[model samples]
Target: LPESVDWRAKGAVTPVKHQGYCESCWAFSTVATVEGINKIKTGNLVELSEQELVDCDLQSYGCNRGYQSTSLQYVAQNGIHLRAKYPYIAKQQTCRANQVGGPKVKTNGVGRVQSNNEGSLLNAIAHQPVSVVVESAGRDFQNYKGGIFEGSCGTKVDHAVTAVGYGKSGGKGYILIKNSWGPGWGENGYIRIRRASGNSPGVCGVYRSSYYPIKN
Candidate 1:
């Protein structure tokens, strides 16, 4: 990449979002990826709506644990709206696809980083934020406060987040990830997890199922 990168500092990221009791991490991750690429391409950092995905995307169960495949696929075809236009309620609601405002941005399709490879994932983040899955239900992850997290987490993924950048800490490699848990959760809704740890899938399984949206 460029030795290091941070989309937040680059002005391509929006404020952290909260999911509450809903399992709509996929929507947040997917929306965050689109937001990143959209900002990079258009130079206007517009916050997007996860609630739009939750309410409109019938391909996945809204407010339920869903995959980013069809969730992101829906974004490609239908497009998405701003958070102000379709604010998140942290719960499922009736499909309002026909009533919502114009989708602020559109993308060609999805892009994937090579599984279990940090180089590929880093390269993707160098350009824009990427959606990644990780284990976050564990004690160490749940109680994470600050600093680079070096927890032991296997590849049975459950939560979706964004890999916004990468850098070094204490002379060790770490990747900066954005969570959907609000600004009070981690480092202002972000985490620097262990990277280049010699393990293929990466610490906390952050290297598995990484993705991003390609702007049209």
Candidate 2:
């Protein structure tokens, strides 16, 4: 792993996406992971489909709540189409049968970083952006305006995000994270969480359920 990495700077990360009022963080997280890895592998930053997983994937509830791992499983089992072809509606819609044969990307498998281990998570992020669930949507988190965030967000993870890189700020190590919200939120739709905090799960339970997709 390198000393630092930023998928955004590498053009691996796509523009920030808005999930609207739906509980579809899983879809956004899945799309972001695939987008990052696809760019790394193919050198083309093509936005993949989130609505495909939202409607087509049956392993979890769509727009109600879902898991990124389950969505990754869906992609591994069945390829995912590109966003330009399928697009995002931000709300639940009936699965389109025609999309099954559309242009797609494949995932060989998915892996989880050892739970509650910051080192393992950091190693994963150094290679590529990692999909993680964190406690966000709070006043401070939602209104975050640049700078590394050391605010008090609890351990109840309710939002899905991407860990894109790490760096030191004010003598404190921090991990750069990408959120699904628009650019108006956080640092242009990104956040910097405290890293190597000595806590097992690190900030916002990010280290608890960290995972990423393997491009096939």
Candidate 3:
């Protein structure tokens, strides 16, 4: 199955929960995987609502906010209801309660940690799909021509995405990552980065770090 696979093709969108002005990126990462899995489990690639989690999952947000791992804990403990129960409206709102929202819900956000290590990443991939956040800025990022990006940005992770699979690229192994923007974006809403991008700590983070479903 081509050592690596692009999870974006298998992932679902969360109505572009823009972390535009806020660094509440954990919010966007959380919804990416939930949407992907829901699509895999059920032929419905519905947008997993996360507004409620953003509002009510208080422990996960607001300054010194948690990463994707922490968010997953909220989902595991609280167990997100269902997308049909709460639909995605594609708008930002204040974090509140009864948060029940989003079109796709089966898969919810989880954990809050930037994934910069390969072990942690492979671990996430072994189980369920995950989102990755990388710092995108300056010349380190500008030269993004196409098919698997390998440039190291000046800063650390500035955005989050999902890790679908990993394999050798140009003789060096790379991670198949999924982004949130749109299909018209990086590598078809995805990019290839070195799992071991020698830089800062937790440069790359993953969402939903606790659940994995295997089929025989």
Candidate 4:
């Protein structure tokens, strides 16, 4: 496993969504990237739950305030459950404790903060398994002409997400993203943004930090 990374040349394109007002982006990101890692590392298709983290993980805090590291810390501390056990509800209502119960891992929170610099991000990936944050680009992102992107926007990150791996399409690099808006979102719970190359705008706020615990 990668114990560390350059934190600079770290950019990959993964599928992610935007959970607007749902405050479950942390849960969405945790499971989404884990799903990708599980797929890549173990080759298993596991569907976790966003509600589980929202309601269970108390540290991460749901409602657009969940941190990526805390989510992983919860997973590490109390392993995770199958998606079938705690399915997603896609709502912001208070969690019902009577709905679930169980603990699998013994991981804790890692005080990693999000950043716009690619170096810190790359280092984060090497330190942790995954990360998450927000991203906001120009209207060109509205149409998202797909393929390798050089975002015609500024380096202002507005959201959060995870960085799984790197790849090239049409001779360009991209950072894989995992949003939290359910399958009804981009590229089936994922999005590919422009890669980093000497102060590339558009791909800011893409980091991993702030997490919580998971129950049941």
Candidate 5:
């Protein structure tokens, strides 16, 4: 296994995106993973539409709490629109089917890491960005600004993000996570969650739940 991985450096990751006052984080997380994998597969990092999910994904609430797996499930069947075609508006609007019915990126399916297994998460993210959920409602996390997050958080798993890389810093392992809270939130819209060794729920419950695209 590689000692470190950063899809951003490899041009597989897009710029940080903001979710604004909405709860469409699941959509952002899932779409970001899809964009990453599609780049690795096709050599083109085409930005997909998180707004498409917000409006079209009927499996979950558009601008409310949502699931990465269900959001992924919606993309598996309907494919997804390009951000150029259905850019993110950070709000719920009419589901524009025409916008979704054009040429788009598609995935063979969705894959999930075994619960609480850091090994599974590492193997997945080593190849592509993975959709991840963490218990981020903690005051420490909400106001977090910098550094590898070593604070304590619960298993409530209330927010979604994309795991783009993993490496060690000051002897402590960390997973580079891309959040939708914008570049001003944490480390330029990214947070490096502690990557505890030996397989466990991981800091922020990051290993507790993860989803990724399966493009074949």
Candidate 6:
């Protein structure tokens, strides 16, 4: 893998999105990964529709909860539209199947980055931003501000997020993560988890079940 990589600086990462009070972090995470891969493939960063999956994907529960894998399956099978066509309303609404067929960004396949393996995750992220699940219900995780987050984020694997990049802070390497909690959460809706933590899953169980879509 390269020493370090940042998809945001390369303009592959899109603007941070908000899930409002919904449990649709999976949708946001899926969209971000799709958005990143599309940029890397087409040389353009277009915001994909989280609302399409939020409303249309029968396998997912809309605002209640969902799986990134299922949403990716939906995208692969049905070809998801862009956010401009069907914007996110946050809350669950009726499925607009008529609007589902738009300019499509297809995925070659989906794969995991090896559970509880940070090195594998890093190697995968060297190519593109990865979709990850983490334990983020703690108060410390909720109020995270700045700096490399080396707090008490455990491996419960509650919320879904995206690992956008990696860099150094205070001479310590960290993984730059994008969150669905809007831009007010941490570092503009992103948080840097301490890298090379020596733990199997690294901080926050980020490597526990990390996954990404293959474009090529």
Among these predicted structures, which one has the highest TM-score?
1
**What digit string (tens of lDDT, one per residue) describes model 5 on residues 1-216?**
688999999999999988999999999999999999899999998899998889888878999867888889888887888898887887899988574575488888999988788777888989899998899999999999888998678768888899999998898889999998888998998898887645377787777788898888
Error of 3 at 151 (Å): 1.5
- Per-residue lDDT tens digits of candidate 1, residues 139-188? 88898878888886676789999999999867888999999898998898
The Cα local distance difference test for each model comes to 0.87, 0.84, 0.53, 0.53, 0.87, 0.85
Each prediction's Cα RMSD?
1.1, 1.4, 5.2, 6.1, 1.4, 1.4
Compute the lDDT for candidate 6. 0.85
RMSD of 4: 6.1
Cα error, residue 75 of model 5, in Å, equals 1.6
TM-score per prediction, in order, is 0.97, 0.95, 0.65, 0.65, 0.95, 0.95
lDDT of 2 at 138: 68
Clashes of 4: 46
Please give, for residues 93-129, the per-residue lDDT of candidate 2 as tens digits. Answer: 8886364565478888998888898889989998888
**Model 1: per-residue Cα lDDT at residue 81:** 84
In candidate 1 the C-alpha lDDT for residue 100 amounts to 84
Better of 1 and 5 by TM-score: 1
Q: Who wins the lDDT comparison?
A: 1
Model 5 regions lying over 4 Å from their true place: 99-103, 197-199
- Regarding TM-score, does 4 or 6 come out ahead? 6
lDDT for residue 74 in candidate 3, whole number 0-100 = 59
lDDT of 6 by residue, 1-216 (tens): 887889999999989888998889999998899899889988989999999889988889999999878887777677678788888998899998575565467777777877887778888899998998888999999999888888787788889999999877688888889999989988889999887577887788777777787776
Cand. 4 TM to true fold:
0.65
Model 4, residue 184: distance off in Å is: 5.5
| Clashes (candidate 2) | 0
Task: Supply every candidate's count of residue pairs whose N, Cα or C atoms clash at under 3 angstroms.
Answer: 0, 0, 31, 46, 0, 0
Deviation (Å) of 168 in candidate 3: 2.9
